[PDB]
Design a binder for these strands. Sequence first.
DNA 1: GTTTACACAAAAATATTTACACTGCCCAAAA
DNA 2: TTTTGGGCAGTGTAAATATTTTTGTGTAAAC
Lengths: 401, 356
Amino acid sequence: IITPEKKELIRNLISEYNITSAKDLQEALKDLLGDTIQNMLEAELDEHLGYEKYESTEEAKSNYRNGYTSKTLKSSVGQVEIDIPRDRNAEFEPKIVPRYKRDISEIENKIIAMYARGMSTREINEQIQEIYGFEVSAEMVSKITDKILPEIEEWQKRPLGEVYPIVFIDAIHFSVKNDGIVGKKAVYIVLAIDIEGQKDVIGIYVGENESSKFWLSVLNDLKNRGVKDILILCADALSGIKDAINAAFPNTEYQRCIVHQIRNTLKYVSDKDRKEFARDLKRIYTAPNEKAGYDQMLEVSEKWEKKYPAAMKSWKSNWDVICPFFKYSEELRKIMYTTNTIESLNSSYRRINKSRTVFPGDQSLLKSIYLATVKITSKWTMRYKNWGLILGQLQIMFEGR
Amino acid sequence: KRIITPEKKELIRNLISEYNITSAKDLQEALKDLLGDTIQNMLEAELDEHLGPRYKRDISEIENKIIAMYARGMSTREINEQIQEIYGFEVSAEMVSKITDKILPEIEEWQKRPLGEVYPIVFIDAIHFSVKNDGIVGKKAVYIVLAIDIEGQKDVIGIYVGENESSKFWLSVLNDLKNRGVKDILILCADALSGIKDAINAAFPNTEYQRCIVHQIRNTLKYVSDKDRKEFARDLKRIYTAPNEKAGYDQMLEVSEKWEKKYPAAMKSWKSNWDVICPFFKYSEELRKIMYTTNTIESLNSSYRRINKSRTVFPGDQSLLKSIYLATVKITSKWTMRYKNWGLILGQLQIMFEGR
DNA sequence: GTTTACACAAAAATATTTACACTGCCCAAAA
DNA sequence: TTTTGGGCAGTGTAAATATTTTTGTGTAAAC
């Protein structure tokens, strides 16, 4: 795609700017960008005033141009200086480079993508100064990433699908400066798999876990747009969620989250060197029926009563909520006990917010979490394996859906 | 002021007509799509100009940016993406290596810079070895020699590599230091093994100095667990806060009796080396603090870890030296601040070594 | 006669700096 | 022995803060 006219243009620009090396070529690149912008601005001024430099007009020329004024631009190649013309009454408006605009490059989206990757504002400042030439302070990075706040509000009011077969609820704790004191806030991510087998984060909510109805409030938000029943929801049983869903979504079959149970009870305080009893814990959720699952749970409890005893106690306490997991098919069971669909989420946030220790205000935390969630969900075009079969099993197990 | 010529006016007009330029981004992408391959070919021809210091080739702006990205530990795909986004052409890993090869005369000048005659304190530290390849693999180790001089500025003096415990390697290091201009070292701290005794007694022996403190703690707590290192940290904190040397001996015997059943073979070495560690307590509290701070060593180790993760790609015969030099200069650029309460330390050093 | 360039300030838009209010993370240590 | 404090090193960003650009208008030079 090399046009001979482009070749002649290259030869002419090499001849006019006297390019003899690569350094000369880059200097001439900067000079050529500046000259082109200045020429276009002079053409725009000629179009605005309606006459060229020093040319008479029959009608009384209402306003005279009165020289140039300097301005330094921030471009992709580097920092360039140009001279822009000016009208006496200051009526002319530049088109390519508008008034007071010096960051003509399109680095905004790149800065936002770097901040979503987990880079600090000062890290981004140093990186941009090193690999671009011009300076962008940390507060400038903050004001640039503030531009997606209407996007955040539209994502919070984003219209969701009608039916969601499987839902997961996860919690991630951070520190937040509220009312002048730094306390602690837990952010709850509501992820869901749709009818086609595609998982996509549907909700992100700031916790404020002082009251229980706030939890219910989240469901009410779903009641605002997710008006259909959820065939299965998987949440870490905490803070009186049972009453919330049973009064909001009573049709939903509420089971204890298997992977959250594994994370919270058998591994919160676990012997690090021999964590590999999940291979036997698989024996619990690879059982055909719930009675065999209870028997294998008793067996592994007998196996693990030598270590700290409080591990298997939670299984005995919550088996009443864990029992509906066995009614599902093996392909359905797979979706339950796969911690990789949950851990990979949490760890991802952990690997994104590794450098952000304390978030000033709720909205900064919300910005960072929305950016991380978008960066993660961008690659989530893969559908679920053996889906459609799962849809048939769902419609058989739930005849009215 | 830029007075433009009518021929350049026609050039700009033809450019705008060819690329249909209406906004600034249109102009930038037009310049990219027009000059990408041109810049690529010019760069490859200018780097292959020798085979296609006395003669040090000049560096370009884009080459300086590539050097900066090389120092930041960026992946080859990532720097390729950045260059494609800015200038509009691809850079292969071999091109990256050929571009980075241009800072070698700078490394020569940095390794041959004239030094002062007397340096109060000198440390030599070792880090892990990402072995270079010219047909062999090595058991050798990377050493950085950093010294604090009569004033209060810290600066890395040398970067060396060798057989790691031959007396000849240490002797060559000290002889290079003496050739660069050094004539007497007041305090030297090296990794305690063979060879350094003879190297000191044959290279810089105004007085014997085997004062090793930060080297001993790391050498003894390397073969222990980080979970217990905090308890080891508390016990060694009790060990280095002793006012007298005999109190330090008592604390050492106590911690050895406490830890000889969980890790018997480590602290034994300490006892075996206690004859050498004794003169450390002769210093005042300030000299002790300046010695065992190790914060600069930890910063250097973190930079070298960022280099070992991402920069060990090409032959380290020049690449390892480039990476270490870039990390050291990145530290020393903003590492020019003077030292804390250096005047009292200087008085104590001048009274402690009076015949200077 | 006109037209534009240039030079001073003052206003306005923008981007840098300071200041949090902490979190981690080492120690120098007391009860 | 475990619990305090005390620097240091980070963070995102509100609020003073400095900087750069644009403007008002008066001249000096140019067409």
